[PDB]
Design an enzyme around this catalytic site. Structure first.
Site, PDB file in Angstrom:
ATOM      1  N   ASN A 170       0.831  -1.204   0.000  1.00 13.34           N
ATOM      2  CA  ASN A 170       0.000   0.000   0.000  1.00 13.34           C
ATOM      3  C   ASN A 170       0.863   1.249   0.000  1.00 13.34           C
ATOM      4  OD1 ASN A 170      -2.600  -1.305  -0.183  1.00 13.34           O
ATOM      5  ND2 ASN A 170      -1.973  -2.272   1.708  1.00 13.34           N
ATOM      6  N   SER A 171       0.582   2.259   0.834  1.00 13.13           N
ATOM      7  CA  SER A 171       1.313   3.534   0.751  1.00 13.13           C
ATOM      8  C   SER A 171       2.786   3.461   1.085  1.00 13.13           C
ATOM      9  CB  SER A 171       0.629   4.652   1.563  1.00 13.13           C
ATOM     10  OG  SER A 171      -0.462   5.141   0.791  1.00 13.13           O
ATOM     11  N   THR A 172       3.233   2.369   1.713  1.00 10.99           N
ATOM     12  CA  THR A 172       4.672   2.256   1.949  1.00 10.99           C
ATOM     13  C   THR A 172       5.428   2.133   0.615  1.00 10.99           C
ATOM     14  OG1 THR A 172       4.773  -0.174   2.224  1.00 10.99           O
ATOM     15  CG2 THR A 172       4.347   1.178   4.209  1.00 10.99           C
ATOM     16  N   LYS A 209       5.024   4.127  -1.732  1.00 13.20           N
ATOM     17  CA  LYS A 209       5.259   5.484  -2.219  1.00 13.20           C
ATOM     18  C   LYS A 209       6.712   5.902  -2.039  1.00 13.20           C
ATOM     19  CE  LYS A 209       0.611   7.356  -1.801  1.00 13.20           C
ATOM     20  NZ  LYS A 209      -0.215   6.166  -1.499  1.00 13.20           N
ATOM     21  N   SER A 212       0.109  10.831   2.304  1.00  8.89           N
ATOM     22  CA  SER A 212      -0.108   9.639   1.530  1.00  8.89           C
ATOM     23  C   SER A 212      -1.090   9.898   0.408  1.00  8.89           C
ATOM     24  CB  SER A 212      -0.675   8.565   2.444  1.00  8.89           C
ATOM     25  OG  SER A 212      -0.044   7.392   2.128  1.00  8.89           O
TER      26      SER A 212
END
Ligand code: NI
Lengths: 246, 4
Positions: free
Chosen positions: A51-53, A55, A100
């Site tokens: 998921n957002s990790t 990014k 995020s």
């Protein structure tokens, strides 16, 4: 979905209470001592959607592809209404990371060809490197990475082992810097994966750089619900505080 | 879609 490594580690089985309600893992890597410590080794190796990790690395790729560069990380909000106030505004790297902001990263990923991403995921050994899934392959889709690997990548990033420009790495670090004190720099990034309207996958990964060491960490939460980055971060902070790192 |  398992990362295979025979690395030694100090067991942190006493961290179990922090993970009430979750199948969770906490992985710490102590840079000076070149040592891993892990709560829930089996879960530490299980790969989950970042998921957002993701990014963090999407940003690095974007720098590497000159989509982002020095003095060139802003994106203007097109006025499309998102559920989070923080997304509903112009962004730069720092804000897009802190909040995020998916659309900012979707916009960057738009300019990354699938093969360029695959090349980067190979270079940085990003988990299963599987990006066949959705266009947003990083969000509860094909791409998965384990907690230990999240730590490995942070370490390789921070140590400048990755083939990204150091200035780009510093910019990305800044973007995920949560607290800067004389005594430490605390860097971290949340991720949350929702399935069937439930938060089933929570990440918080980062590191605490002190005046003499760096402690890389990844907390993963799996549960039926409430396994989100916020809770992963809360748990991480509890652990890091207990460890007197922050 | 970032523009630049
Ligand atoms: Ni663009």
């Amino acid at each position: 979905d398992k990362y295979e490594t025979n690395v030694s580690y100090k067991k942190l089985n006493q961290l179990a209470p922090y993970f009430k309600g979750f199948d969770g893992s906490f992985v710490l890597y102590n840079e000076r001592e070149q040592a891993y410590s892990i709560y829930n080794e089996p879960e530490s190796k299980q790969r989950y959607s970042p998921n957002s990790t993701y990014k963090i690395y999407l940003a690095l790729m974007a720098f590497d592809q000159n989509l982002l560069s020095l003095n060139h990380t802003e994106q203007q909000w097109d006025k499309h209404q998102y559920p989070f106030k923080e997304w509903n505004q112009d962004q730069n790297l720092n804000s897009s990371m802190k909040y995020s902001v998916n659309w900012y990263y979707e916009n960057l990923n738009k300019h990354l060809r699938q093969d360029e991403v695959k090349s980067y995921l190979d270079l940085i050994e990003y988990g299963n490197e599987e990006i066949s899934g959705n266009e947003n392959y990083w969000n509860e889709s094909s791409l998965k990475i384990s907690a230990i690997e999240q730590v490995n990548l942070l370490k390789n990033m921070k140590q400048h082992n990755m083939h990204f420009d150091n200035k780009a790495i510093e910019k990305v670090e800044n973007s995920m810097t949560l607290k800067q004190k004389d005594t430490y720099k605390y860097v971290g990034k949340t991720g949350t994966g929702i399935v069937n309207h439930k938060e089933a996958n929570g990440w918080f990964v980062g590191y605490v750089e002190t005046k003499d060491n760096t402690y890389y960490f990844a907390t993963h939460l799996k549960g039926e619900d409430n396994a989100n980055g916020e809770k992963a971060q809360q748990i991480s902070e509890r652990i890091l505080k207990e460890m007197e790192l922050i | 879609g970032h523009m630049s």
